[PDB]
Structure 1
Amino acid sequence: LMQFTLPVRLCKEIELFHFDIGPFENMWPGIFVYMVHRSCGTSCFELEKLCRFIMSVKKNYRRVPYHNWKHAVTVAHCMYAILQNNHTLFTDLERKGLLIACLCHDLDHRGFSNSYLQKFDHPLAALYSTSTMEQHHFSQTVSILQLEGHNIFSTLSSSEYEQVLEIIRKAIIATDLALYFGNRKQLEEMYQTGSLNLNNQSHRDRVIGLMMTACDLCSVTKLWPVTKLTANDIYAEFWAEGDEMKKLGIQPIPMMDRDKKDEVPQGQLGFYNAVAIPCYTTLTQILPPTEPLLKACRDNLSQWEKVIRGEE
């Protein structure tokens, strides 16, 4: 059969948590197929259907600075690296579902937060009152799965099919950072009082939600230059949202106000202490081989500290 293979530097570095998928857009599909084949098998999906699904997914990501096709493939690579470092902890269905979930998790993102859609009074905010974009992203995922020739799950039973779509739904809802805080507190408490039980489906669900937050944030776990240049894309979106808030007559919060450019180093520190470090710490407690994500995060935190001390 037809194995996908990568040039040697990519074949070695793609196994590491800090791998950057590179600026060559045309290689990103092959990089994803490579990762499905190794984390799932050459048997998981019909090659033709999978290729047709990947290209329709790509086409439904928009040309925004951050929440774009490159982000989708980046989040999927982090998941690949978690799965490959925790071989025997996951079901066959989870292996199938989570890479697809990660590829799909920001489908048809417009570069605006749930908060901005609610203030603009966008139709999606009446259709979905919480996790607005995330319920959209899962809805776009089902759309694409139902196009002709796009059912990559066509070999599962009705109940295996329903279970995979349920893993994907919860994984995508979990990328709503508003939900992350409470999910990580519960996991922290369950880990610390020894109640954490991976045979309990509601426990697995929480663990997969935390993996989703971890993959979604993995830009803070790259080499410093990748971390820093990504943060420019992230802010380019947030600042355009801030401009849109000012057009609605609403002073945006400082994170979104390009006039507060200077405070970015300190906003990144708060973010690493409040979200990132706690995320990768609890993840490392539950899945010890994901520790390189925590260690990279802590290295980037110390790089933002140097930026504030004027040494960078």
Structure 2
Amino acid sequence: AGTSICTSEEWQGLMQFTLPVRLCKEIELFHFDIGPFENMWPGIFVYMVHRSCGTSCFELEKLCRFIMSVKKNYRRVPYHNWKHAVTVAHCMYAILQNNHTLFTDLERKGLLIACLCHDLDHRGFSNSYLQKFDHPLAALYSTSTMEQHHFSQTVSILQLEGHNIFSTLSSSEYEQVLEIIRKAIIATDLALYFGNRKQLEEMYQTGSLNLNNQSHRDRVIGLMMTACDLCSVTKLWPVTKLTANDIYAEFWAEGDEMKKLGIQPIPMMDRDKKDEVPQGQLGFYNAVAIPCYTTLTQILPPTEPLLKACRDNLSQWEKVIRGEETATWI
């Protein structure tokens, strides 16, 4: 109820924060895992905005208020949380650094913010659930239901007193950036990923892909947003495996709610069907993640380590299925 606002203590603290030097080099890398550094997550986002866009891109006060309010409008859910937001934002930063001049300064600042904001106010329920049980949000947003809500939450935060990091933009650039952000957040709807990937694959294979074509650009950005959203599948196996637990904590809790309403959940959301998880991950990697990173690598060659990592993780799930797991902690 309402949009939440960071305290003065919170945003002034972030202003005064400094990143330990050792980390600077690590953050550049695709495989970097933010996990061990919880206190530093907001500062890591600052550092990334500053290195990619410049320290003069945003007024520092408005930026710190914005980031800290963004954090306060993530809910305490097992997966679609503040930690996930920064993880996604970090993947984008690594894509952007490796492909810097392909994207405009407006696209870079827009995309880093869109990633941080792309799951705002997520409740732990999927679009399938909201549409099945006619949540009011599905009345408002007939397709891409939660994504449309996340964009609306983003705009609400920008509109808070002293939070509009985009106010210094020309009126024309302001409309362009909100449109960059809307499209990017919408593209995180995996329902849309399937057609987009198939289109991009066709454009690439026939050689029609042209990055000077706004419709093509929009699509490449969309695939980038898919790759960033799913990037937990591109970490080192222990990291990826641990994250998988949080994803399923969330799925199972939704499954439980379905059962109360007289509907048996899909196996993926059934806590009594945990034996089927490894095969379901295999299916997810084969249907979604592998193709995503495969096509992204063809379009943006420097993103190849995301694909190589994802391939290594598919192999690990295959190992689990063959009974070849070694010891695991969670």
TM-score by length of 1: 0.98
| Aligned-partner Cα distance in 1 for 2:17–2:76 | 27
User: Contact 1:5–1:11 at 8 Å: present in 2 too?
Assistant: no
**Unmatched runs of 5 consecutive residues or more in structure 2:** 1-13, 326-330
**Cα offset, 1:5, TM superposition:** 5.0
> What are the Cα deviations for residues 113-172 of structure 1, in whole angstroms up to 9, with x where unaligned?
011011221110101000000000000000000111001011101110000000000000
Comparing 254-263 and 206-215, the one that deviates more:
254-263
| Aligned-partner Cα distance in 1 for 2:281–2:70 | 31
> What are the Cα deviations for residues 178-230 of structure 1, in whole angstroms up to 9, with x where unaligned?
00000000000000010100000000000000000000000000011110000
User: Contact 2:62–2:165 at 8 Å: present in 1 too?
Assistant: yes
User: Contact 2:297–2:304 at 8 Å: present in 1 too?
Assistant: yes
* Identity percentage of aligned residues: 100
**Cα offset, 1:26, TM superposition:** 2.4
Count of matched residue pairs: 312
| Aligned-partner Cα distance in 2 for 1:67–1:2 | 26
Q: Secondary structure at the match of 1:24?
A: helix
> What are the Cα deviations for residues 93-129 of structure 1, in whole angstroms up to 9, with x where unaligned?
0011000000000000000001101122111010100
Q: Given the superposition, is the C-alpha separation of residues 11 and 5 from structure 1 closer, same or farther in structure 2, using an over 3 Å criterion?
A: farther
**Cα offset, 1:23, TM superposition:** 3.9
In structure 1, the partner of 2:236 is 223
Q: Given the superposition, is the C-alpha separation of residues 20 and 88 from structure 1 closer, same or farther in structure 2, using an over 3 Å criterion?
A: same
**Cα offset, 1:2, TM superposition:** 8.9
User: Contact 1:3–1:42 at 8 Å: present in 2 too?
Assistant: no
Q: Given the superposition, is the C-alpha separation of residues 292 and 185 from structure 1 closer, same or farther in structure 2, using an over 3 Å criterion?
A: same
| Aligned-partner Cα distance in 1 for 2:101–2:16 | 23
| Aligned-partner Cα distance in 2 for 1:174–1:277 | 18
| Aligned-partner Cα distance in 2 for 1:155–1:308 | 54
Comparing 20-29 and 72-81, the one that deviates more:
20-29
User: Contact 2:53–2:108 at 8 Å: present in 1 too?
Assistant: yes
**Unmatched runs of 5 consecutive residues or more in structure 1:** none
User: Contact 2:256–2:270 at 8 Å: present in 1 too?
Assistant: yes
**For 1:208, which of 205, 221, 229 is the aligned residue?**
221
**For 1:110, which of 117, 123, 129 is the aligned residue?**
123
User: Contact 2:15–2:61 at 8 Å: present in 1 too?
Assistant: no
Q: Secondary structure at the match of 2:240?
A: helix
| Aligned-partner Cα distance in 1 for 2:37–2:71 | 14
**Cα offset, 1:24, TM superposition:** 3.8
**Cα offset, 1:248, TM superposition:** 1.1
**Cα offset, 1:259, TM superposition:** 1.1
> What are the Cα deviations for residues 245-296 of structure 1, in whole angstroms up to 9, with x where unaligned?
1111111111111111001111011111110000000000000000000000
User: Contact 2:15–2:64 at 8 Å: present in 1 too?
Assistant: no
In structure 1, the partner of 2:176 is 163
**Cα offset, 1:12, TM superposition:** 1.5
Q: Secondary structure at the match of 1:30?
A: helix
> What are the Cα deviations for residues 7-28 of structure 1, in whole angstroms up to 9, with x where unaligned?
2432121111011112443211
Q: Given the superposition, is the C-alpha separation of residues 18 and 151 from structure 1 closer, same or farther in structure 2, using an over 3 Å criterion?
A: same
Comparing 273-282 and 5-14, the one that deviates more:
5-14
Given the alignment of the two structures, is residue 99 of structure 1 paired with residue 112 of structure 2, yes or no? yes
Given the alignment of the two structures, is residue 31 of structure 1 paired with residue 25 of structure 2, yes or no? no
User: Contact 1:4–1:33 at 8 Å: present in 2 too?
Assistant: no
| Aligned-partner Cα distance in 1 for 2:79–2:208 | 38
User: Contact 2:79–2:246 at 8 Å: present in 1 too?
Assistant: yes
**Cα offset, 1:4, TM superposition:** 6.9
TM-score by length of 2: 0.93
> What are the Cα deviations for residues 38-59 of structure 1, in whole angstroms up to 9, with x where unaligned?
1111011000000000011001
| Aligned-partner Cα distance in 2 for 1:269–1:98 | 30
**Cα offset, 1:31, TM superposition:** 0.2
